[PDB]
Amino acid sequence: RPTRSELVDRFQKKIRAGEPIIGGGAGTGLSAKSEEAGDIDLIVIYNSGRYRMAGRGSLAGLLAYGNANQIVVDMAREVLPVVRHTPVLAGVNGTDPFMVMSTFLRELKEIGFAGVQNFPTVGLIDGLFRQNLEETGMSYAQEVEMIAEAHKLDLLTTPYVFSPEDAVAMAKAGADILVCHMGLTTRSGKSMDDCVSLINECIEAARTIRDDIIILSHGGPIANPEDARFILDSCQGCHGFYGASSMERLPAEEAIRSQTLAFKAIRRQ
């Protein structure tokens, strides 16, 4: 059972060899197993993965359709056993008012997760609704604290950050990896130029605290291996990419559909 330090050494080794760190979301055990088979560097499981693999939108994991934290424990039964040599992280809902994080994080460690991520995250929420949440005890600060406690438990931490300010707070928390989240994936949101600017801004910020933080990109217009490649070319300090919808949903969806059509096409002589 590798330590956090060993995992961070594993990654920084690949980074020095010019190899990207790719993390993936798994919503089913088959997803997890297939991602391991493609030599994925780390796998994360959250409620959104389930909902995604149910054919629903990713943002379904942020709303009142189920308890995120209880769903992730339930999903562990499906996923952990079929993954044999790849670290699996738990998406933790850090603002859960009915969870004691310290206890829950220990529980996740004993279940077998290598680490955690803050997901669902209020960082995806904007507007006056976001402001009210921050004002009434459902703030990103609480996610930051959750990451800090996880770090103190020697769990790997790969938190989503949406700004330099977030990048700092999570650096100071002891985050091993920062996933710069650009927004929901797939001309609605951020330009590719905006992503470049923000990601570089977060890199410079992160580094004010610590020069050896690993920084990966996720979301908005970064939708496919070529988009991920453009970020690696554009942002020097960025060394990889986290994908969930890109990794498991769209591929499966295409393949199942193509296969169905193929059977449907056969005719008798």
Contact residues for Cl ion, defined by CB under 5 A:
48, 57-58, 136, 185, 243-246
Question: How many residues sit close enough to its own copies to count as binding (CB under 8 A)?
Answer: 107
Q: Are 238 and 202 a contacting pair, CB within 8 Å?
A: no
Using rule CB under 8 A, residue 263 touches its own copies: yes
Min separation Cβ 117 and Cl ion, Å: 9
Distance CA 146, CA 104 (A): 10
Question: Is the separation of the CB atoms in 175 and 160 below 8 Å?
Answer: no
Kindly write out the interface string for residues 158-197 of this chain, putting x where it contacts its own copies by CB under 8 A and - elsewhere: -------------------------xx---xx--------
Tokens 């929420």 locate to 125
Question: Which residue among 7, 32, 170, 177 contacts its own copies (CB under 8 A)?
Answer: 32
34 binds, among Cl ion, its own copies, none (CB under 5 to 8 A by kind): its own copies
Residue 127 is a binding residue for its own copies (CB under 8 A)? yes
Contact call for residue 269 and its own copies (CB under 8 A): yes
Q: What residues contact 109, with CB distance under 8 A and at least 6 apart? A: 153, 155
244 binds, among its own copies, Cl ion, none (CB under 5 to 8 A by kind): Cl ion
118 binds its own copies (CB under 8 A): no
Scored b (16 or more CB within 10 A) or e, 178-191 reads bbbbbbebeeeebe
For position 237 contacting its own copies by CB under 8 A, the verdict is no
Our finding on whether 37 is near its own copies (CB under 8 A) is yes
Contacts for 180 with CB less than 8 Å, ≥ 6 apart: 161, 162, 167, 198, 199, 202, 215, 216, 217, 218, 238
Query: What single DSSP character describes residue 137?
Result: T
- Nearer to its own copies by Cβ, of 172 and 190: the residue is 190
- Among positions 131-150, residues that touch its own copies (CB under 8 A) are 131-133, 135-138
How far is Cα 181 from Cα 161, in angstroms, rounded to an integer?
A: 6
